[PDB]
Amino acid sequence: SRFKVSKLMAYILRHSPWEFGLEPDEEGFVSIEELVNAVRKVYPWVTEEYIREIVERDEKGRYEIRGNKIRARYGHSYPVILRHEEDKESKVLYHGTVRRNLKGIMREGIKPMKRQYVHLSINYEDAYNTGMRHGEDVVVLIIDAECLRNKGYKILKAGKKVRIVKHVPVDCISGIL
Ligand SMILES: Nc1ncnc2c1ncn2[C@@H]1O[C@H](COP(=O)(O)O[C@H]2[C@@H](OP(=O)(O)O)[C@H](n3cnc4c(N)ncnc43)O[C@@H]2COP(=O)(O)O[C@H]2[C@@H](O)[C@H](n3cnc4c(N)ncnc43)O[C@@H]2CO)[C@@H](O)[C@H]1O
Ligand SMILES: [Cl-]
Ligand SMILES: [Cl-]
Ligand SMILES: [Cl-]
Ligand SMILES: [K+]
Ligand SMILES: [K+]
């Protein structure tokens, strides 16, 4: 299924490419031809044409292809430089988290966990679903993205829904849902 193969693509591209003999460049890209060979170790019926269709059809825009190179657009657990197109349009974004985090966030703003980027969403629904990852008592923070930009921070379009930024200062949080 596309779900099973996409789930494995995400794992390879975000988390364990070396396990499959792949060497991502500094931007997270691997050869799509070698990715087929890697995926075929689990699902031998996969074709390059199939992986390309998965990228084209993916609901979240999880993947990016340029020529012979493919990457996950977000979510990597190893260091990547992601020079995505800037979101200069969004006025308000959302960040899902757990209530226990409010104290630190109110003191220090939203910081990225493993350096790199803080994840934001354009939808309140996606942000809540995201916060459920870290526990039951989820709150969604409203982010004034205009304020963020004016403080000098670039918000980048990492997927159809996901937005990434280096840090969110406390002053840029306009509400809690
Ligand atoms: N044993 C493993 N444990 C943990 N991680 C593993 C494992 N093995 C490989 N990994 C990779 O290690 C990364 C983890 O961390 P993470 O990078 O943050 O990725 C998240 C998501 O990434 P994303 O959607 O935000 O882009 C990513 N993910 C989700 N959907 C994806 C897609 N279509 N294509 C590519 N990736 C997708 O799976 C991750 C979980 O997310 P979660 O939504 O809680 O679980 C989904 C579903 O699995 C789950 N569910 C249960 N049953 C069914 C069912 N019958 N049908 C459909 N869903 C079902 O019910 C939740 C609702 O969707 C990921 O790469 C993993 O593949
Ligand atoms: Cl393996
Ligand atoms: Cl990321
Ligand atoms: Cl909590
Ligand atoms: K990647
Ligand atoms: K921006």
Swiss-Prot record:
Task: Answer whether the UniProt record assigns the keyword Transmembrane to this protein.
Answer: no
What stretches pass through the bilayer?
none
Broad enzyme group: transferase
Entry superkingdom: Archaea
List the InterPro entries hit by this protein, alphabetically.
Ptrans_KptA/Tpt1, RNA_2'-PTrans_C, RNA_2'-PTrans_KptA, RNA_2'-PTrans_N
Q: Extract the GO molecular function terms from the UniProt entry.
A: NAD+ poly-ADP-ribosyltransferase activity; tRNA 2'-phosphotransferase activity
Q: Which UniProt keywords apply?
A: NAD, Transferase
Q: Does the keyword Ion transport apply?
A: no
Its EC number(s): 2.7.1.-
Name the Gene Ontology biological process terms. Answer: tRNA splicing, via endonucleolytic cleavage and ligation
Give the protein family.
Answer: Belongs to the KptA/TPT1 family.
Described function: Removes the 2'-phosphate from RNA via an intermediate in which the phosphate is ADP-ribosylated by NAD followed by a presumed transesterification to release the RNA and generate ADP-ribose 1''-2''-cyclic phosphate (APPR>P). May function as an ADP-ribosylase.
Could you tell me which HAMAP family the record lists for this protein? KptA (MF_00299)
Q: What is this protein called?
A: Probable RNA 2'-phosphotransferase
| Organism of origin | Pyrococcus horikoshii (strain ATCC 700860 / DSM 12428 / JCM 9974 / NBRC 100139 / OT-3)
